[PDB]
Point group: D2
Chain length 317, copies 4
């Protein structure tokens, strides 16, 4: 039987006998994603160019509006907003969502794949909601995922039941389930990082990469892929296996990427898919945050590859 994202969320919902609040939130987000996809693919661009005589802002506005009006959220953290948004009393629900509405967008000039990253938490207690409700480790995530706007638009959604991939059929505006209960490869053949900054690498990253290009065990060198758009690189890592790194270098002791709405959601997907995600010192999902916009170093991917990185990291102490 054909399955759609809306249908799959409603049946998972009916199974868990929940109130429907998580379904309303996910459906609202699904609508936002289709709106973002439409804009990203430049639908209606001819009007801008004067046929009848911003994108990251629109993306944020779309996600903000869709979630507020969902009556399922109370606290919203976005890459585009210095402070958490507190949902007005009347539209309040029990969920905290942290999102990146259009990751990769500063490089949209070249039509690079971009994406939307999201993670959903249950609010902490009865206390009037505040920014603190967002300061939660990944381990608390109820659901997470992303929409990649690549050659086609795909939504990846991870929850307790696992990871499922839905392709947007733009002819009908519907996410079709194409990959069920997906699991990452145990070990891959591709590593992904910005090698351009080799100079600043932690000695362990240097040795790990060296092991990829010159294995001392006669096996084939890994290929390298690095798009520079996190959703794109993480998606390829999920689909093909391998390793993706944005490591802590001595000048950036906490990485570049953001914990709340890039690192945590991706780590949740990875683990739900049977891969791993570490900062080097600990599981990404175990980091306890003190700032909504704080950074984290991150290495994720196939378990065999991330265990191999960790083993090297342990050696260098």
């Amino acid at each position: 039987d054909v399955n759609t994202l809306t249908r799959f969320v409603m049946e998972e919902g009916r199974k868990a006998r929940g109130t429907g609040e998580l379904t309303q939130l996910l459906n609202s987000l699904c609508t936002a994603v289709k709106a973002i996809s439409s804009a990203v693919r430049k639908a209606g661009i001819a009007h801008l160019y004067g046929i009848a005589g911003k994108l990251d802002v629109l993306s944020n506005d779309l996600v903000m509006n869709m979630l507020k009006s969902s009556f399922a959220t109370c606290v919203l953290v976005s890459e585009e907003d210095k402070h958490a948004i507190i949902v007005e009393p009347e539209k309040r629900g029990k969920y905290v969502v942290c999102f990146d509405p259009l990751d990769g967008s500063s490089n949209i000039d070249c039509l690079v794949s971009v994406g939307t990253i999201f993670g959903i938490y249950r609010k902490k207690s009865t206390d009037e909601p505040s920014e603190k409700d967002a300061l939660q480790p990944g381990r608390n995530l109820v659901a997470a995922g992303y929409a990649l706007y690549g050659s086609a638009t795909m939504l990846v959604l991870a929850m307790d039941c696992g990871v499922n991939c839905f392709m947007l059929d733009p002819a009908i505006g519907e996410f079709i389930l194409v990959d069920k209960d997906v699991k990452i490869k145990k070990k891959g053949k591709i590593y992904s990082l910005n090698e351009g900054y080799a100079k600043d690498f932690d000695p362990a990253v240097t040795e790990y990469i060296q092991r990829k290009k010159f294995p001392p065990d006669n096996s084939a060198p890994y290929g390298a892929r690095y798009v520079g758009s996190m959703v794109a690189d993480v998606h390829r890592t999920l689909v093909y296996g391998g390793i993706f790194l944005y490591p802590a270098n001595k000048k950036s002791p906490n990485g570049k990427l953001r914990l709340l709405y890039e690192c945590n959601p991706m780590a949740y997907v990875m683990e739900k898919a049977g891969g791993m995600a570490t900062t080097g010192k600990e599981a990404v999902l175990d980091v306890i945050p003190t700032d909504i916009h704080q950074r984290a170093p991150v290495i994720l991917g196939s378990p065999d590859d991330v265990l191999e990185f960790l083993k090297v990291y342990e050696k260098h102490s």
Copy 2:
């Protein structure tokens, strides 16, 4: 005024008082590219998943381009990455142009939603003889027109001709290519390098040193950033937009590189040069190589002239 691919080509076609054969061919190419875009974006996939309840994308793309160009009445010889021999347009349908194309480059990785693209190169038929494969064995310098469609976050057609490089965005709401960047030029010098470093162990000594300089400059400037989508169209378009360098060079294991000359390297080299950039095999100009085999490979280094020169410096230092 608002300009569209078709408006642009008819406009240029009139300025030069041509027959309209090249215009008819581009129009057809544009129709096939919208159809490839639609399918790449997975419109109608719900039916394949049994919503009511065929072809692989590379095959469909090939059939779309072949069939559009044939029926254009503007072509006589078609070479595709997908077909071993040149296709010889049947006589009733024959025109004066030779097209070499890769109908869906980068498709071997379409499983992870990577940016894919269509690449094309157009030649005037030289000789007087019945058309044949040999007509496609023209050096890059003979190209009347070339470019590519990139099916990325959005769809863009890049069209290069004698008058420069023009970038058209597809508005899928109306199915028009909108001219959004006129007469494009690449930066003299960029801050990105693009190649598969995974295969460093097989690098040409010259490639190894060039890359080491990018990562640890001797003049202590800031090191370049690295990017490699692994899809040529995407890597070459970024090169064109942010400047820098893209490499797919020869080594011992592949003395002639991996990328194809007629339908990948030539068209991208032509684009690069019309945008005032540089494309080299290391020993000669990509555009100057005389082909002997329609599917022959070429090493390619292309991008900002200052990066390409700097690579040649290092390549010369190693003979």
Copy 3:
């Protein structure tokens, strides 16, 4: 607040504290309507004309398959099928659905508006599901409506809460709520029927139509519109007021329109809009059917006009 069909239905569903079955059915139906729309609008027609080297049947398959896989239905009556379809046991839910997957497709050659009409009942007994479960008077309906594939695609949904119209935004495949709680005008200015067949008219219809064209007082005669496509004429009757007629006569004593999946859901929509629908002898919604494909006469629309028609009808009784 922006509202969609999915969000609307989940909202009305949580208010009523129902299980979700109705909502899964409406979501499935809505997905089918999007697919019918895309095909009606000829998306992908270039492939059939050879760019690379049934519509009534497809519309039927889309609805049948989406409804079957909704888990919300047990008996399906279609214009297109001789007998009722009984959903296999693993898939059985509580609703009986009666539909016309592509009303008006008869004249789709001239690109006249076509539509999808549906009516939803609850199965009444715990008997094994059979055709008989579809033999309910329209008073028994839980939901009814239609999709109109016209200049735009619109979904009109009637429930106890009233009639709501949703406009499909094809950019994103969401039906947007555009008219809340619609009511028909008390009296209209438009009469709609096939006047070409006047020689066969009942003498009551003849006189009623004669009075529309030749008022006894000094009032404006009525204008006339007849698309010949039932969804289009009914939707116009809904928005502008007036009367639509496909009445009985000597040659066709039970009219020509089908009761289960044409007259009943239009009668329902009309009555929820504060309008009327009669056979001439009784309300359409009170007819007890004995055959799934039985015909009914229908005269519907503004209450003042239908009451007037009934006045004239009775004069010839």
Copy 4:
């Protein structure tokens, strides 16, 4: 061999060895139509209804700006504008274009089919361009036709070579040629007019219609259809045969439909497809306009139908 509007026009443009100016006019009109089609199908309506927190006017702007920018036109007349628009000198071309950018749009509240109608003349006078330039009889037309935004969008183009029908495939934004060298039936079985004006009909019309309902030879009575939107009524007349009438009445002593951009284009299409269009007095195409917004009575369709009507017009002087 698949054919598209742009390709067909180029092929035709090359045969006749023309300069390409008309091809640029037509391509520009084709682009305008796709943009109107997309607005009429309400793409991006979600943004108007607050998802991120006038159509005849837009249809007019699209057609005007596309025509102006084509360099192929000098004088433009539009249903929407009081006076002829005189193209600025730097953009001037040789063609005069009369159009109704969105016909039937007054009833679009009910999602009735709408359309775009155009007629194209070569400028005949050597005077500076002015309104007079648009005042030629329809006999002078070089090309005419319409787009019908029905259940799908079709462009109908009529020129010297006859009438051709193109279906818009909105997946790729290309009009695909679907019916070549179209001919209307010699005699039809449907008549089309607003019978609500029966009180104002002159005796010839009244008699003609009587015959359609009560044939004096015991052939089958005609069916009646009247969408009330001219493009739809005329397209059906084209596709199925029969007759479409809009005679004069007390509100419209000179008739209702506009001669320049409603009656001429349709008459031209009708004549090229082997049909007829009359005012009762003379061919619509032979009427010599004096005002750009002047109206005309029109009776058009199958030849044997218009001939039968003209006989009855004769019998009443």
